[PDB]
Amino acid sequence: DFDDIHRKRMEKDLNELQALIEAHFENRKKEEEELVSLKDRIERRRAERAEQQRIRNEREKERQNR
């Protein structure tokens, strides 16, 4: 007894810390930069949609104005 405390504690004392650091690094890398880039891409597409909407609205208002 009291000799399995080493073999159940020291293991996770380093392996768990290193593995969680690895998980945090990979999750941040996968998540944050890709999300910001994708949001910028969607913003550019949204601006293009806004331009298309403005053009169509203006041309239809020009024709229909009677």
Binding site: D1, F2, D4, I5
Partner: protein, 371 residues
């Protein structure tokens, strides 16, 4: 085959196969019948949602715990909980697995006998064994001595053990536990305007207690500080909005543990029943018990309790002895980890209550040599 280490508890049922690190399925032990009428046809509405399913439909249920203070008050509901645990959370038929239940100290005999009778007749297990909830928590710490304070959610008990020889005359069982703290918190929240009454809102108050409350190192200084500054007021968002702000209710709810006069209980706090439990022991093993005080159970997870308790005991104890409080990070599942370790032992493999033995002596076999 492998053994099933179930642990009924009172508030959270923890179960899993023997030999692992953590319980496989942990879910509240509540059985809630619906209370309204119900107009949709064919919706597939059941008559009783148990376990973690009734913590999601709790808006239209009346949850009721089947275990009040360690003892079991509603046997049909407890049978339903066990059936759910075996068949849906573990999906292993009990006909092929030994079981290791756990029971608080100083409980009524009839409860234990009915438990074994159910396990042998309804579920028809091969062999079951009942163990005291504190010896397991001592197993999990890897010690062999020490006095363990297992403050669960139903009942707080304090079993001292030396060199493997338990001291039956020094067990101090006190019935203040997490549930009474939930009720007291729900009662002092009314001083700001928030009223929780329904049995469903008791769960919300429990969540508030878990996430916000903490044990003060010194009570009077905290009461004075919270009454002048506002650095303590932490806010919390209800399940529908309308955030609430908890002031000095934060450290007044768990203070009831050290002053049970708050909820009208006469007895002394958990800081003084441990010292009394030690002083009943012999004069030559008091140093070891002082040095190996073990904490377990859910309710001992309050942030800052391992320092308050040490300060209190150091105040009570003689100045020469060293007071050390073992507070492992895996406190909540300490009893179940110990249960897994005990069930995995080879020396223990012949202590099970085999079914043929029960057939020969009846349910009263549990009080006999097979304890």
């Amino acid at each position: 085959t492998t053994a099933l280490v179930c642990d009924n508890g009172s508030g959270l049922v923890k179960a899993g196969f023997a030999g692992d690190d953590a319980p496989r399925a942990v879910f509240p032990s509540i059985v809630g019948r619906p209370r309204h009428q119900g107009v949709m046809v064919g919706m597939g509405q059941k008559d009783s949602y148990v376990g973690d399913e009734a913590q999601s439909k709790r808006g239209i249920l009346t949850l009721k715990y089947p275990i009040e203070h360690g003892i079991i008050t509603n046997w049909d509901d407890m049978e339903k909980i066990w059936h759910h645990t075996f068949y849906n959370e573990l999906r292993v038929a009990p006909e092929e697995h030994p079981t290791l239940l756990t029971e608080a100290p100083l409980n009524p005999k009839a409860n234990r006998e009915k438990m074994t009778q159910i396990m042998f007749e309804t579920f028809n297990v091969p062999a079951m064994y009942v163990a005291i909830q504190a010896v397991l928590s001592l197993y999990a710490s890897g010690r062999t001595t020490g006095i363990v304070l297992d403050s669960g959610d139903g009942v707080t008990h304090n079993v001292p053990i030396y060199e493997g020889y338990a001291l039956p005359h020094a067990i101090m069982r006190l019935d203040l536990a997490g549930r009474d703290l939930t009720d007291y918190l729900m009662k002092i929240l009314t001083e700001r305007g928030y009223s929780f009454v329904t049995t469903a809102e008791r769960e919300i108050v429990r969540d508030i207690k878990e996430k916000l409350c903490y044990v003060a190192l010194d009570f009077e200084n905290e009461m004075a500080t919270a009454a002048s500054s506002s650095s303590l007021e932490k806010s919390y968002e209800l399940p529908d909005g309308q955030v609430i702000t908890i002031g000095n209710e934060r450290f007044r709810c768990p203070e009831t543990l050290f002053q049970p006069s708050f909820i009208g209980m006469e007895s002394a706090g958990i800081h003084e029943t441990t010292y009394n439990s030690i002083m009943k022991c012999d004069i030559d093993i008091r140093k070891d018990l002082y040095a190996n005080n073990v904490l377990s159970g859910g309710t001992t997870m309050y942030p800052g309790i391992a320092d308050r308790m040490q300060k209190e005991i150091t105040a009570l104890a003689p100045s020469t002895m060293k007071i050390k409080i073992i507070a492992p990070p895996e406190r909540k599942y300490s009893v179940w980890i110990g249960g897994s370790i005990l069930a995995s032992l080879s020396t223990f493999q012949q202590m099970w209550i085999s079914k043929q033995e029960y057939d020969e002596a009846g349910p009263s076999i549990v009080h006999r040599k097979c304890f």
